């Protein structure tokens, strides 16, 4: 799996010192800014922006609805492959109690189905430029990011599957908040290409938009990096493909080993099947009713997801 949302803290400390300070401040303050976390279902209004240069990139409404179905399964532990979670880890599995619905009202109060379509001359979008998120750069401007989760679907090229913007970046980069997914790996079955054809590229990206990090700590295989989640076993490097349970490494050398079936690893879509309770706590904390950075999204979520 390829992803543009790695946080190699050793590298960031040297290459991006202001970003290092911002991430460290966010983590020092995350416990003090998560007391009024909601006890009820969190609803996320979604807008999907299809940005296409050709017919293959202009994916079907059914393809998009299947992706929303997958998010609602994975974030509510309603994925049928939950049964595949090894019994040693199933007791750590979390139910995020987060729902996703396509928007029915656009930012001007007009009816919408929550899908936009933008033809473009851009052949390939760049994560570096964030050009898919700007109408003037060949993409499509975000819908009010305080109220909608914006998911852009486009051609990210031969390598990149998707990328997300993290919550610590919301204050300074509000208009680029959201997630971008490669069109070939959006939705389940249908036009999606194996082995990333079960909609988990977006489950993984939405996990980053909800403050989660790669489970192995983005540290080049060492045991020094962390995902800041105590119930995800310390893990060396990423896993790819479809490992066999149990898989141990130099960070967790005893069975049950590393949680390679966590959505925040780099494994194939069909071999992923859980978030942990600790990851759920972190994601839900962003909706703390008094100080949660994404709390406003809950104020008008019902209004925006009904006709
Ligand atoms: Ca961990
Ligand atoms: Ca590691
Ligand atoms: Zn990632």
Numbering used by the authors: 21 to 327
Reproduce the article's own wording on this structure.
A variant, in which the general base/acid Glu225 was replaced with alanine (E225A), lacked activity. This variant was used to obtain the intact zymogen for structural studies. Previously, this strategy has proven successful for other MP zymogens. We obtained two different crystal forms for native and selenomethionine-derivatized promirolysin E225A, which contained one and two protomers per asymmetric unit and diffracted to resolutions of 1.4 and 1.6 Å, respectively. Crystal structures of the catalytically impaired promirolysin point mutant E225A at 1.4 and 1.6 Å revealed that latency is exerted by an N-terminal 34-residue pro-segment that shields the front surface of the 274-residue catalytic domain, thus preventing substrate access. Promirolysin E225A has a compact structure of approximate dimensions 60 × 45 × 45 Å, and it splits into an N-terminal 34-residue PS (Arg21–Ser54) and a downstream 274-residue metzincin-type CD (Arg55–Leu328). Tyrosine-switch Tyr286 pinches the extended segment I together with the upper-rim-strand segment Leu181–Tyr183 of the CD. In the capital interaction for latency, downstream Cys23 Sγ binds the catalytic zinc at 2.11–2.22 Å in the different structures, which is closer than typical Zn–S distances (2.31 Å), and contributes together with the three histidine ligands to a tetrahedral zinc coordination sphere [Figs. 2(c) and 2(d)]. Finally, the primary activation site Ser54–Arg55 is access­ible, and Arg55 protrudes from the molecular surface by virtue of a hydrogen bond between Arg55 N and Asp308 Oδ2.
